[PDB]
Design an enzyme around this catalytic site. Structure first.
Site, PDB file in Angstrom:
ATOM      1  N   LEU A  45       0.834  -1.184   0.000  1.00  0.00           N
ATOM      2  CA  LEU A  45       0.000   0.000   0.000  1.00  0.00           C
ATOM      3  C   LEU A  45       0.875   1.243   0.000  1.00  0.00           C
ATOM      4  O   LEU A  45       0.482   2.254  -0.561  1.00  0.00           O
ATOM      5  CB  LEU A  45      -0.961  -0.005   1.181  1.00  0.00           C
ATOM      6  CG  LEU A  45      -2.039  -1.087   1.134  1.00  0.00           C
ATOM      7  CD1 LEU A  45      -2.830  -1.090   2.414  1.00  0.00           C
ATOM      8  CD2 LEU A  45      -2.959  -0.887  -0.045  1.00  0.00           C
TER       9      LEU A  45
ATOM     10  N   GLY B 214       8.179   3.020   7.056  1.00  0.00           N
ATOM     11  CA  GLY B 214       8.536   1.648   6.728  1.00  0.00           C
ATOM     12  C   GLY B 214       7.783   1.156   5.493  1.00  0.00           C
ATOM     13  O   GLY B 214       7.961   1.685   4.399  1.00  0.00           O
TER      14      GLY B 214
ATOM     15  N   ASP C  85      -0.411  13.136  17.679  1.00  0.00           N
ATOM     16  CA  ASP C  85      -0.203  13.266  16.243  1.00  0.00           C
ATOM     17  C   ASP C  85      -1.537  13.242  15.476  1.00  0.00           C
ATOM     18  O   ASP C  85      -1.597  12.769  14.351  1.00  0.00           O
ATOM     19  CB  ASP C  85       0.813  12.259  15.737  1.00  0.00           C
ATOM     20  CG  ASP C  85       1.401  12.586  14.373  1.00  0.00           C
ATOM     21  OD1 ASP C  85       1.274  13.742  13.943  1.00  0.00           O
ATOM     22  OD2 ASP C  85       1.960  11.682  13.738  1.00  0.00           O
TER      23      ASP C  85
ATOM     24  N   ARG D 262      -3.965  12.970   7.945  1.00  0.00           N
ATOM     25  CA  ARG D 262      -3.166  11.820   7.505  1.00  0.00           C
ATOM     26  C   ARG D 262      -3.303  10.642   8.476  1.00  0.00           C
ATOM     27  O   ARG D 262      -3.239   9.506   8.028  1.00  0.00           O
ATOM     28  CB  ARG D 262      -1.677  12.121   7.262  1.00  0.00           C
ATOM     29  CG  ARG D 262      -0.898  12.453   8.527  1.00  0.00           C
ATOM     30  CD  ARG D 262       0.531  12.967   8.340  1.00  0.00           C
ATOM     31  NE  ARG D 262       0.979  13.451   9.655  1.00  0.00           N
ATOM     32  CZ  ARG D 262       1.038  14.712  10.094  1.00  0.00           C
ATOM     33  NH1 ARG D 262       0.781  15.721   9.278  1.00  0.00           N
ATOM     34  NH2 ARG D 262       1.316  14.950  11.368  1.00  0.00           N
ATOM     35  N   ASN D 263      -3.630  10.895   9.756  1.00  0.00           N
ATOM     36  CA  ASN D 263      -3.683   9.851  10.784  1.00  0.00           C
ATOM     37  C   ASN D 263      -5.105   9.420  11.121  1.00  0.00           C
ATOM     38  O   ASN D 263      -5.362   8.832  12.196  1.00  0.00           O
ATOM     39  CB  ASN D 263      -2.898  10.293  12.019  1.00  0.00           C
ATOM     40  CG  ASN D 263      -1.411  10.310  11.710  1.00  0.00           C
ATOM     41  OD1 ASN D 263      -0.962   9.591  10.813  1.00  0.00           O
ATOM     42  ND2 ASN D 263      -0.635  11.116  12.406  1.00  0.00           N
TER      43      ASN D 263
ATOM     44  N   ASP E 182      -2.334   5.520  14.064  1.00  0.00           N
ATOM     45  CA  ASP E 182      -0.971   6.039  14.149  1.00  0.00           C
ATOM     46  C   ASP E 182      -0.682   6.513  15.571  1.00  0.00           C
ATOM     47  O   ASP E 182      -0.504   7.710  15.830  1.00  0.00           O
ATOM     48  CB  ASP E 182      -0.680   7.014  13.017  1.00  0.00           C
ATOM     49  CG  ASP E 182      -0.423   6.364  11.654  1.00  0.00           C
ATOM     50  OD1 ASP E 182      -0.425   5.114  11.561  1.00  0.00           O
ATOM     51  OD2 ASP E 182      -0.209   7.106  10.677  1.00  0.00           O
TER      52      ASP E 182
HETATM   53  C1  LIG Z   1       3.738   4.042   4.559  1.00  0.00           C
HETATM   54  C2  LIG Z   1       2.467   4.398   4.650  1.00  0.00           C
HETATM   55  C3  LIG Z   1       1.804   5.256   3.806  1.00  0.00           C
HETATM   56  O1  LIG Z   1       2.444   6.090   3.171  1.00  0.00           O
HETATM   57  N1  LIG Z   1       0.465   5.172   3.606  1.00  0.00           N
HETATM   58  C4  LIG Z   1      -0.368   6.203   2.961  1.00  0.00           C
HETATM   59  C5  LIG Z   1      -1.602   5.438   2.547  1.00  0.00           C
HETATM   60  C6  LIG Z   1      -1.772   4.438   3.679  1.00  0.00           C
HETATM   61  O2  LIG Z   1      -2.520   3.285   3.227  1.00  0.00           O
HETATM   62  C7  LIG Z   1      -3.215   2.533   4.135  1.00  0.00           C
HETATM   63  C8  LIG Z   1      -2.829   2.353   5.438  1.00  0.00           C
HETATM   64  C9  LIG Z   1      -3.610   1.560   6.314  1.00  0.00           C
HETATM   65  C10 LIG Z   1      -3.309   1.280   7.695  1.00  0.00           C
HETATM   66  N2  LIG Z   1      -2.187   1.791   8.290  1.00  0.00           N
HETATM   67  C11 LIG Z   1      -1.612   1.355   9.500  1.00  0.00           C
HETATM   68  C12 LIG Z   1      -1.211   2.259  10.473  1.00  0.00           C
HETATM   69  C13 LIG Z   1      -0.674   1.819  11.673  1.00  0.00           C
HETATM   70  C14 LIG Z   1      -0.541   0.464  11.876  1.00  0.00           C
HETATM   71  F1  LIG Z   1      -0.031   0.016  13.044  1.00  0.00           F
HETATM   72  C15 LIG Z   1      -0.942  -0.450  10.940  1.00  0.00           C
HETATM   73 CL1  LIG Z   1      -0.782  -2.151  11.239  1.00  0.00          CL
HETATM   74  C16 LIG Z   1      -1.488  -0.012   9.741  1.00  0.00           C
HETATM   75  N3  LIG Z   1      -4.136   0.559   8.435  1.00  0.00           N
HETATM   76  C17 LIG Z   1      -5.221   0.048   7.815  1.00  0.00           C
HETATM   77  N4  LIG Z   1      -5.611   0.182   6.570  1.00  0.00           N
HETATM   78  C18 LIG Z   1      -4.774   0.941   5.794  1.00  0.00           C
HETATM   79  C19 LIG Z   1      -5.153   1.167   4.459  1.00  0.00           C
HETATM   80  C20 LIG Z   1      -4.400   1.957   3.655  1.00  0.00           C
HETATM   81  O3  LIG Z   1      -4.664   2.196   2.341  1.00  0.00           O
HETATM   82  C21 LIG Z   1      -5.649   1.399   1.694  1.00  0.00           C
HETATM   83  C22 LIG Z   1      -0.347   3.998   3.976  1.00  0.00           C
END
Ligand SMILES: C=CC(=O)N1CC[C@@H](Oc2cc3c(Nc4ccc(F)c(Cl)c4)ncnc3cc2OC)C1
Length: 324
Positions: free
Chosen positions: A23, A29, A142, A146-147, A160
């Protein structure tokens, strides 16, 4: 002394995760989407999976397990919770997939279809989330668009927790030190004195609401971070977005008062935004508002736009998958 944290930390075997696709990536990371098929369950659970680059940086596994601790200890419709961790070469965090992504990107890419009712409902839901976090004595530190993640256009959740901090049974302020900081979302007292409270989070909520109401504009765009505390000291604030009535902008402004205790409480923000959401066009003025629609769960290619049809039989959202 303080209540025991009896959250469960689930360790999940690597062999239960399939269809792993990227994604996004960066410093934070890598996050992937995947399916989690707990063994002998007859369920497939859409998941996101967060790992850092290398098995090294003992700092890094410390940070990510700090995040896991916090995400495992929350349970609320407007907050993202940890499903479990996977202990591989790298430490991977596993959570409910939020298929529409982050709200910042969502408001940017869908500006033309986002009406007043969605904006105000998001404001309510983020406030509920933040209130829940307060009741659990957490300071997020935070909060930003974005979060905030989008499960459906109707249903957002805060995520986040990598900077979140608890607060002792009789402690008020967190006192931080060093590290990269989201200066444009921070209360003045946080920038000046690294003080952080429930009330500093309200400041950040204000900025977050500004982001939504401008369809994802960048706050103090072009201003260097080093200048923000001065701008603020002089009494400058983010400007009234075009779509906002004075009613909405005033709430924003109250979130950005110098006296922390003069700022609204999350419980109050829930009430105000809730009242506004009953008559949304009275509080936000958007051209061609009344005729917009975004995807709802009760649409055809809602479940086909995410999934393979091979899988779909036994898919269960994480919100419907509960354990003893
Ligand atoms: C590097 C990142 C980045 O630039 N992006 C920008 C787009 C975003 O996309 C998704 C993230 C998702 C998510 N995130 C998450 C946060 C904390 C955690 F601890 C965990 Cl385990 C996950 N959780 C759930 N669903 C998400 C869906 C996303 O896009 C479809 C990541």
């Amino acid at each position: 002394g303080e209540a025991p944290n009896q959250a469960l930390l689930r360790i999940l075997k690597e062999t239960e995760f399939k269809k792993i696709k990227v994604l996004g990536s960066g410093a934070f990371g890598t996050v992937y989407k995947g399916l989690w098929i707990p063994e002998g369950e007859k369920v497939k659970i859409p998941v996101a999976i967060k790992e850092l680059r290398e098995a090294t940086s003992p700092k890094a596994n410390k940070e990510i397990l700090d995040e896991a601790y916090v995400m495992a200890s929350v349970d609320n419709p407007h907050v993202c919770r940890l499903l479990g961790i996977c202990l591989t070469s790298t430490v991977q965090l596993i959570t409910q997939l939020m298929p529409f992504g982050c709200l910042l990107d969502y408001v940017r890419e869908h500006k033309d279809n986002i009406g007043s009712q969605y904006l105000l409902n998001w404001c309510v839901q983020i406030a509920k989330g933040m209130n829940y976090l307060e009741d659990r004595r957490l300071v997020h530190r935070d909060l930003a668009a974005r979060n905030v993640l989008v499960k459906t256009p109707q249903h957002v959740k805060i995520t986040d927790f990598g900077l979140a901090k608890l607060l002792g049974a009789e402690e008020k302020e967190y006192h931080a030190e060093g590290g990269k900081v989201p200066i444009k979302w921070m209360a003045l007292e946080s920038i000046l004195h690294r003080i952080y409270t429930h009330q500093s989070d309200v400041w950040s909520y204000g900025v977050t609401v500004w982001e939504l109401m401008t369809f994802g504009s960048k706050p103090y765009d072009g201003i260097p971070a080093s200048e923000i505390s001065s701008i603020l000291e002089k009494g400058e604030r983010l400007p009234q977005p075009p779509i906002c009535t004075i009613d909405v902008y005033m709430i924003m402004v109250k979130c950005w008062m110098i006296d922390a205790d003069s700022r609204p409480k999350f419980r109050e923000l829930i009430i105000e935004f809730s009242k506004m959401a009953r008559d949304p066009q009275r509080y936000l003025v958007i051209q061609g508002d009344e005729r917009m629609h975004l995807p709802s769960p009760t649409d055809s290619n809602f479940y086909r736009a995410l999934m393979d049809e091979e899988d779909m039989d036994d898919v269960v959202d994480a919100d419907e998958y509960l354990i003893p």
